[PDB]
Design an enzyme around this catalytic site. Structure first.
Site, PDB file in Angstrom:
ATOM      1  N   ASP A  56      -3.183   7.436  37.731  1.00 35.60           N
ATOM      2  CA  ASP A  56      -2.684   7.398  36.605  1.00 35.60           C
ATOM      3  C   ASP A  56      -2.892   8.283  35.233  1.00 35.60           C
ATOM      4  OD1 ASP A  56      -1.498   5.819  34.396  1.00 35.60           O
ATOM      5  OD2 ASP A  56      -2.628   4.484  34.823  1.00 35.60           O
ATOM      6  N   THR A  57      -1.779   9.034  35.184  1.00 35.92           N
ATOM      7  CA  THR A  57      -1.549  10.138  34.639  1.00 35.92           C
ATOM      8  C   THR A  57      -0.838  10.195  32.862  1.00 35.92           C
ATOM      9  OG1 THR A  57       0.888  10.498  34.738  1.00 35.92           O
ATOM     10  CG2 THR A  57      -0.615  12.362  35.361  1.00 35.92           C
ATOM     11  N   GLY A  58      -0.563   8.372  32.540  1.00 36.38           N
ATOM     12  CA  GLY A  58      -0.641   7.226  31.208  1.00 36.38           C
ATOM     13  C   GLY A  58      -1.489   7.101  31.477  1.00 36.38           C
TER      14      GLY A  58
HETATM   15  C1  LIG Z   1       4.988  -1.205  33.804  1.00 36.70           C
HETATM   16  C2  LIG Z   1       4.011  -0.343  33.080  1.00 36.70           C
HETATM   17  C3  LIG Z   1       4.657   0.397  32.009  1.00 36.70           C
HETATM   18  C4  LIG Z   1       4.106  -2.458  32.275  1.00 36.70           C
HETATM   19  N1  LIG Z   1       2.378  -0.941  33.427  1.00 36.70           N
HETATM   20  C5  LIG Z   1       1.325  -1.025  33.539  1.00 36.70           C
HETATM   21  O1  LIG Z   1       1.577  -0.761  32.290  1.00 36.70           O
HETATM   22  C6  LIG Z   1       0.492  -0.684  33.965  1.00 36.70           C
HETATM   23  C7  LIG Z   1      -0.006  -2.232  34.336  1.00 36.70           C
HETATM   24  N2  LIG Z   1      -1.490  -1.540  35.278  1.00 36.70           N
HETATM   25  C8  LIG Z   1      -2.259  -3.256  35.324  1.00 36.70           C
HETATM   26  C9  LIG Z   1      -1.055  -4.542  36.412  1.00 36.70           C
HETATM   27  C10 LIG Z   1      -1.530  -5.104  35.946  1.00 36.70           C
HETATM   28  C11 LIG Z   1      -0.252  -6.978  36.567  1.00 36.70           C
HETATM   29  C12 LIG Z   1       0.208  -6.641  37.733  1.00 36.70           C
HETATM   30  N3  LIG Z   1       0.285  -5.491  37.953  1.00 36.70           N
HETATM   31  C13 LIG Z   1       0.225  -4.673  37.567  1.00 36.70           C
HETATM   32  C14 LIG Z   1      -2.329  -0.879  35.153  1.00 36.70           C
HETATM   33  C15 LIG Z   1      -1.391   0.263  34.146  1.00 36.70           C
HETATM   34  N4  LIG Z   1      -0.480   0.793  33.760  1.00 36.70           N
HETATM   35  C16 LIG Z   1       0.134   1.777  33.620  1.00 36.70           C
HETATM   36  C17 LIG Z   1      -0.261   2.227  32.459  1.00 36.70           C
HETATM   37  O2  LIG Z   1      -0.607   3.782  32.178  1.00 36.70           O
HETATM   38  C18 LIG Z   1       0.414   2.269  31.181  1.00 36.70           C
HETATM   39  C19 LIG Z   1      -0.199   2.563  30.122  1.00 36.70           C
HETATM   40  C20 LIG Z   1       0.382   2.666  29.031  1.00 36.70           C
HETATM   41  C21 LIG Z   1       0.312   3.355  27.679  1.00 36.70           C
HETATM   42  C22 LIG Z   1      -0.290   4.139  27.424  1.00 36.70           C
HETATM   43  C23 LIG Z   1      -0.914   4.654  26.028  1.00 36.70           C
HETATM   44  C24 LIG Z   1      -0.926   3.864  25.121  1.00 36.70           C
HETATM   45  C25 LIG Z   1      -0.663   2.268  25.587  1.00 36.70           C
HETATM   46  C26 LIG Z   1      -0.293   2.392  26.920  1.00 36.70           C
HETATM   47  C27 LIG Z   1      -1.952   2.374  29.525  1.00 36.70           C
HETATM   48  O3  LIG Z   1      -2.655   0.907  29.345  1.00 36.70           O
HETATM   49  N5  LIG Z   1      -2.855   3.556  28.946  1.00 36.70           N
HETATM   50  C28 LIG Z   1      -3.673   3.311  27.922  1.00 36.70           C
HETATM   51  C29 LIG Z   1      -5.242   3.417  29.224  1.00 36.70           C
HETATM   52  C30 LIG Z   1      -4.973   2.428  30.244  1.00 36.70           C
HETATM   53  C31 LIG Z   1      -6.284   2.481  31.367  1.00 36.70           C
HETATM   54  C32 LIG Z   1      -7.689   3.283  30.758  1.00 36.70           C
HETATM   55  C33 LIG Z   1      -7.706   3.739  28.930  1.00 36.70           C
HETATM   56  C34 LIG Z   1      -6.555   3.701  28.703  1.00 36.70           C
HETATM   57  C35 LIG Z   1      -5.369   4.201  27.474  1.00 36.70           C
HETATM   58  C36 LIG Z   1      -4.405   4.033  27.212  1.00 36.70           C
HETATM   59  O4  LIG Z   1      -3.798   5.678  27.600  1.00 36.70           O
END
Ligand SMILES: CC(C)(C)NC(=O)[C@@H]1CN(Cc2cccnc2)CCN1C[C@@H](O)C[C@@H](Cc1ccccc1)C(=O)N[C@H]1c2ccccc2C[C@H]1O
Lengths: 99, 99
Positions: free
Chosen positions: A25-27
């Protein structure tokens, strides 16, 4: 090797002993694995994603064998819907996004 | 065109001509931006991130330009801390994950 992203970049990891399936997960800044109890000393940690915040527990310096590499890594343990290998581990591994 | 994951992989994209900063996110199945208004032709859609569930507006075949490539993709708008380009676009772009 290459992952095209037409399916989820999920692989079988070993936190070791334990095979978990993980999303690459690059995000994600950090890494969160569910369904595991891990070790002596964790810190309280609070993580922000889409649609709110989650309370995880932080275990540093952990045995992780994935992609035939071995890494010692910091991984959190939280109530995550899917296991995530975030940037902190992806860099360790030397993965990149191309093109 | 070859992002090391040492920092957040953020580029500038143009959405229907409008520049936006987006995080290129392999863990996102779909794409969601804030701060742009794309019109009244949307469907309501609920999406689940790591913190929980949010409401979004879904548009189809929106024009996206990223580093020399013009594509047409589905994009959701909503209240998000950061703009995300998920797999539905990364694939349209021909991007992969490298090891
Ligand atoms: C389409 C959508 C964009 C809603 N997808 C997600 O949010 C999914 C959801 N699932 C789950 C899902 C849930 C329900 C149904 N299907 C799937 C888990 C993984 N994410 C993707 C993540 O990469 C999202 C990023 C977004 C973000 C970046 C920075 C700050 C806030 C939000 C994310 O969650 N990042 C945070 C993060 C995440 C994990 C660990 C550490 C950190 C820190 C931080 O960067």
């Amino acid at each position: 090797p290459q992952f095209s992203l037409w399916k989820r970049p999920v692989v079988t990891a070993y936190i070791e002993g334990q095979p978990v399936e993980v999303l690459l997960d690059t995000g994600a800044d950090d890494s969160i694995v569910a369904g595991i109890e891990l070790g002596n000393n964790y810190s309280p940690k609070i993580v922000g994603g889409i649609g709110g915040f989650i309370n995880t527990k932080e275990y540093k310096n952990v045995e992780i064998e994935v992609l035939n590499k071995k890494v010692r890594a910091t991984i959190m343990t939280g109530d995550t819907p899917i296991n995530i290998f975030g940037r902190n581990i992806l860099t360790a591994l030397g993965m990149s996004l191309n093109l």
